[PDB]
Every structure is written in C-alpha cells, then in structure tokens.
Symmetry: C3
Subunit: 121 residues, 3 copies
C-alpha cells in the first residue's frame, strides 16, 4: 500500500512506506502527488473554541492552491473525506484561515492510494 | 478483508469473516472497533413517510456516543458514507430520534477495513 | 481490480480490464452493475460559465433513474464521491439538466469495485 498522514502535532509527516512511491512530502500540511491514480483523503479538523483573532473560521483542503473542500463549522471537530483522481505534480495541502483557530494537536489529514488505472494518466 | 453490515431487518449483524479480527458486534446497530486503522462506513437510511410521533427526523452515526454524521431529510432514502481513522475500543452505532420514524426493513449500515497503518495507533 | 471511467470527452467509456466482470457500459454516461458489492463512485462536474439556456444548474448521479446525488453549484468544478452497495442490474448514470450547462471536456465519472461481500446479495 501507499499511505501518508500529517499530524496531529507534534507528529509531522508519517509515510508508509517511509519513502513511498505515490507521494512526496513538501512541508508541514503539504504533499505532492507522484503517481497518477485514485486517492482517498481523510482527516480531522479540531477548532480551537478559545480563538481570539480576526478571521472567520475556515479550513480548506486544496489542490494546486484551490480549495476542493471547505470546513466552516467552529463548534465541533469535523471529519473530512473524499475520493479524487490526481495527477503527478498535484500539490495537496490543508490550509487554515488562521493557525490559531485550530487545535493542531488534534488536527490531521492523510491520503491512501486506492488504485492506479491506466486511464488516470 | 474485514467487513460487517447490520440490517436491513430482519437481518442483524452480518460479518465477513464471521468472527472478524477488525470489529466485534455489541448489540443491534452497534459495534466495537478492535483494530486501529482506516475504515470506510456506508449505509442507507429509509424514512417512514407515515411517521406519527413527536420527534423531528434525525438519524445519527455516532462514535463513542457523539454524532459524526447526522441525516435530517425525511423525504427520501439517504445514503451515508465516510472514511475515518478509528482506535481499538471505539464504539460505532447508528441512532434514531425515534425507532418509528425509519423503515428498519430498508435501513442498514456497514463498515469495511481499508488499511491498518502503523500511524493509526 | 475492476474500475471504469466515462470521459472527459472526447474519451468515452474506459474500462479496466476492458471487459470487466463488475460492470457493463450501456451508453454515454451510463453503465450497468453486474456484480453485487460495495462500489466507490468518483467524478468531476465542470460547469460551463457561459451557459445561455433555460435550465437551472443541476447534475444528478442516478441509480435506476433516481438521483442519489445532486450537484447544483454553477460557480466551480464540483467533485463527487460516494460509497454504495449496488445490486446486479442497477443502472448508474450521470444526468445533466442541460447538456449545454456543463463542459463535457472536463466532466467525468467513474467507479471502483471495493469488495464483494456475501451479504451484498
């Protein structure tokens, strides 16, 4: 298999196998797809109920800097999930309207390679 | 593989294999996760269009007594699905605002173990 | 494995393997389930931002002519995904409120057979 998870802090990128064929970590919360195919994304976003800043609550799962999912409920932990066809070179990341509006010690996301069809490239 | 389905009535828990490593049935609509890992949940909730009771329509998929999904549309059969990381000991159940507001003979839910990453424990 | 994808145009049905055990193509955007089991559906719906017709924007994923998902946002590409238990003979299709309100050259859907439990038949 090929799976990866970022977080929750203090854990960073956890890849199985450690140098997987399907993805490459770029930086915290961000990876690059290496293998064309169908991927399942999962995750958990934990709002900080004591947030004291300016930003509306919003967490975005992004593909090449564009939000493919947006989570906007600040009252509960929200789970995310999806199935997507990705191309080699696609950049996938979880982005926060403010770092301070989530509990990073209870927030994570990951990815599982499901299949690699010829039609995905 | 490791898969389980409850219902629709009169079927109860259907586990494959019959004593699976990944989950244990507890009672109708309720199971316990035995193996840390990534699970896909699926299901179908069929409202009873002749319900005559007091409760608003709501069906909850719950993890340790907390709703991780809520279905509130009483006009159509609703499908549920999700991908989740669960821990051994987690209790997963489908809960109804009223037993009488769903057609249990057309309502079911189940679970499929997808992968068991080291990072899930 | 057993996977299929329709589109985006000019690609039509792409099945792997080419004559798969699990599904049979019927016509553009439409297939028939041959094997009882749990399937993951995925897809992408690209609205045409220059649509000049009469219909409200709506794209339906249908099972036996009934919409199991509806996509109604004309402002962005929308991804679809779901996990479903299907029966042999079920007809699955993507249906548009108007052919002219989507960009068929950037719209596709597909299916992956996940497992074939005895309880699915």
């Amino acid at each position: 298999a090929c799976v990866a998870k970022f977080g929750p802090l203090p854990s960073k990128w956890q890849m199985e196998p450690p140098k997987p064929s399907c993805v490459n970590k770029i930086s915290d919360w961000k990876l690059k797809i290496l293998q064309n195919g169908l991927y399942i994304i999962y995750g958990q976003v934990a709002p900080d109920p004591t947030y004291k800043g300016f930003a509306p609550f919003e967490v975005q799962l992004c593909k090449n800097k564009e939000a493919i999912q947006t989570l906007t409920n600040n009252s509960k932990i929200q789970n995310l999930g999806g199935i997507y066809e990705f191309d080699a070179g696609d950049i996938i990341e979880l982005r926060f309207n403010s770092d301070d509006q989530v509990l990073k010690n209870n927030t994570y996301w990951g990815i599982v390679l499901l299949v690699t069809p010829q039609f995905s490239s």
